[model samples]
Target: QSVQKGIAITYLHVTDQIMKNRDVIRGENFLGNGEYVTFAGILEANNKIYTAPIPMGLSVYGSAFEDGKWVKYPELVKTEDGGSNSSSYEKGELQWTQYPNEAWVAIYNDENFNNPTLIRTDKISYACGRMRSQYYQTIWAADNGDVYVFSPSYAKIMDADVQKTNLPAGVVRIKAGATDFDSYYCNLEELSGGKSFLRCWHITGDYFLLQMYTGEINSRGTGATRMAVFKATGNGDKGELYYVDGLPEPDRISSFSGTPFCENGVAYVGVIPITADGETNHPAIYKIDPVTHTATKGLTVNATGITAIGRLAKDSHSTYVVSATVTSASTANYLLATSTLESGSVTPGNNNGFETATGTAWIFYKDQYLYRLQYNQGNEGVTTAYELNTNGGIAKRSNEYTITRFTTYGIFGENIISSSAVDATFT
Candidate 1:
């Protein structure tokens, strides 16, 4: 059965009940507490495993799923001074590489998790901005404007032929001095006219929907254009690109700051853009519909700028787009609710003590609750789960939460950057 908004709340109930009775459950040996698993990357290949630590220049953190929670696994030691940084690791023969800053470190993955043997090491100028795992291979985008496909079985880097054909022809190969140093491959065929400025993207299955900064480069070599969305299919070939018109350009767009939610065949990408000419300018949220290829203004808050957009998730029936905006130096947060793209409403909420200015939000669906990664200032971050509210009021948390702080790492600096999740169920 659906709730007031036609959203199924089954998992929500289980999580809610568990949190409500959390205190009592603790007496029964159930901690009723969830932990945050932070890492640079997470990937599962051939029943083996692959994970990297974020912020580079540090030890790689990894964990294996045991029972229902994540258990800390052996840490991957950094062979050089660079750490993982923007590097990506794949599980096949256990190969790990640090591009641009360091050489590739190859290791063999033993099922026993004992001492792993080193294979071979090589130095390559290729630097990856992001790494994604597919069926049999891991796809990595290089800062040098090339995409590499690694073969885990042979521990050999696939040639450009194997790598280029893996994706569609329309998926342009970014080369040195191609267009701009900041431009990367955008959307696939499903939606075209794709653009990439800061190397941030949103993808599902084989389809990629991306936002890119487009305009003339200024004297300081910065892009002055606005952000646009492009759509492409997942087939790796035969994809088209289209632009979402009707939205005003903002001064700057953030790769890690927007939320893209997809349902049925449609995807909704929302971003906070700063516009208004000069001193009177302000920040506003722009919701772009990938299906219609149209952009519309959603919620507008005066004297505030949106800092980050969380993951787009759905309960049973209703889909939600959660955003965090920063007001003044104090850091006030807000949430917007929408049942449909055409007509919807937004409800603002306080971020509790967690500041939104310094961090990014990551929403993960576990059990049935939506767990949010609330990265606060002081390099502190916490994870809080909430039951889906059908009545369109403030989100109701299933459990009381405690703020947890940890050291921030990597080139992204102290700010929370990109985050992604892979569902083991799909395999």
Candidate 2:
């Protein structure tokens, strides 16, 4: 038998007794007590593993980065016990990155480049800004483990509102093991869209696809004007970009279609662009051949009034998409719609017959589908999701679904739930 992994080892009983216990539900990945590394989590380079961060008062527990021996990067910090800021997910975005012999929190995943960056609240400011990006800073992780920190075009904008300015964007690099930024590739080159800005950055395979906004840069609702793919060289330098041709324009920028995750050899990302020309907008799937660095507009979704693409991913050959519909300047009609994408067809799902209380879109895996961060009402950081799913049988771990909590890491070894497997060997 195994146990829950914390500062020490938190153990559990697998008997029907534990499941029968009233306070907790052992149906699957949900919980009680506490957890380190919520989706507001991290990844590591050594130890033949990865981990999430646990916020215990003024310190971080269960957060381990095994390079040579073991070192806790931030060491420790102070925060209210069990409060939102208690953990990275609650209030801060503690991401992890890595160097030749180091680690931190960021992105890039199994489908893409599973790069983790621990949520470092101190490195982030303005309450809403972050290192994953900045006032306009865009960060992208390379398949080679090299993650970049890019400042948006502005060259400088006092406030990103509509502060019109004439300056080119810029970027700097940091080696996987080194903390300090090592070099500069293209500053004036990145955000060179006259008055364009970055919307989001995603990884396909070898390169990270960048979405940009041309003109109307400061407008919050502004979509990417076009996309540019940058392939990081061995020495953290730049090669010319492979601009995607014949796709949507700046207003209907394709980047909003959620993060593009790779499955098998194909990379898929979703979109919510409703173009006036008609064929472009609507909810749809944009397929890309990471090898060819080209994207093809494919799979038109059977849904409407979409604000942004929610969850776009795959489970085996199964792919699905969730679209958030916000009517009236993101004011009313705040609803989420989900659709399934396959080789040639899209299926409509039962729309929220089960309600959800989610602030930001965070994903998790309970079965063979997609999800986002969910917190029960009035319960601070308490998140609970129930899958009315019955016996899909032998949980086969697949790409697309993301593990947002270490709490779900239950049981040592069970063919039923491997991602949540936490044996003595896990720590």
Candidate 3:
């Protein structure tokens, strides 16, 4: 019986794959096997969730991240006659590479998700979703509305046992409101001296965080702990690439469970807790300064692992906030704290922000308030809201409402939206 309006929650809903067996999951743990009935829609401004038909898999919602109300999805529509569709499909010998699941990036205005503008230059493989890996910056919409799509070296196998092959791994772009892809491609593998990377996340302006494979490429997610910084330039120009310093040999960062989020020009990543040589390590979140190309250790939690970290507005005067999900014994908890930017280094608060027990909740910040949408299995889920105090802590628990099942939750509003549950004024 709760009512709230004007604040929309965006998400990806798969009707067919709901409640699928977790053990039989394919590729990334979040992905479910079988044909997808995916909907690229949102919970509307009236507290009612809306659904619109679109192609299967994740689509790039540029409006949510940037200033436009567009969601772009990559698709590969093959001709029935089996002949090459030169307009969209890539001409290649490899069967899987030539005709993959998703090919062109279809751009859709938020007002109409059914009709989209397609970029039909070449066939795009694994561009809609992160099949074998989870990288948030796969398709990035810059501040100026330029959209860029990135890829690594490897390609997933078709039919589960097909001969493995590689896709054209590089960076491509579509200028602001353009109907076609720009004549620009940056070969990532060649830029990294032939070293293949798994995925990437955009840090700040023209800068990105890349997870480079440290050793030989393998099917399992390993040897991808090494990180690098990429500075992208205008079309037809090669960006600068350099390895990052000051980060320990990490277990994993920006995996399927969570991703690296940026606030106030600084990006944050949660390193999973690891154990090696009879030593159990606690989880901690690291702050990455893209300008310096260095990783600095931040809040070290007592939980088994840290999944995500985001910033919330503490007050109208200052932007010092910290929000994260820490898991222990398979139970996820929400930790809210505050930080102050002093002399270019962040000083953590008293490490207290109403430690609430949020079981696998999707945390998002909207309208100067923090919201947590907890998925209650076999029951109606709850969405809780919290506001921050002047002391930079959770001052009050605001509202609670029920919602149906959803994945990849996000906030929606022309006035209130960030890259990932973040506030613009973090500094």
User: Largest TM-score belongs to which candidate?
Assistant: 3
Per-residue lDDT of 111 in model 1: 23
CA lDDT of every candidate: 0.32, 0.35, 0.45
Query: How many clashes show up in model 2?
Result: 43
Clashing pairs in 3: 63-68, 75-103, 76-103
Total colliding residue pairs, candidate 1: 25
Query: Residue by residue across 343-416, what tens digits does model 1's lDDT show?
Result: 33343544322232233444434322344455443333454544445553335464533333322111111111
Among all windows of 10 consecutive residues in model 2, the one with the lowest summed lDDT is 19-28
Of the two candidates 1 and 3, the one with more favorable lDDT, higher being better, is 3
Ranking by lDDT: 3, 2, 1
For candidate 3, lDDT tens digit of each residue in 1-427? 1111111223322212112111111111012211122222232322222221112221112112233222221122222334322111222111223223333454545522334444543433444222221112256555555666665534442333322335545677777766578876676666777776666666777787787777655555565777788777833477667777766665534332245667778777666544512222444566778788888776555444454455556546334334445444555454445353221222223445355556443444433555565555335555555556677556546444565443333333421111111001111
* lDDT (Cα, 0-100) at 274 in candidate 3: 47
Cα misplacement distance, residue 44 of candidate 3 (Å): 16
lDDT-wise, the better of 1 and 2 is 2
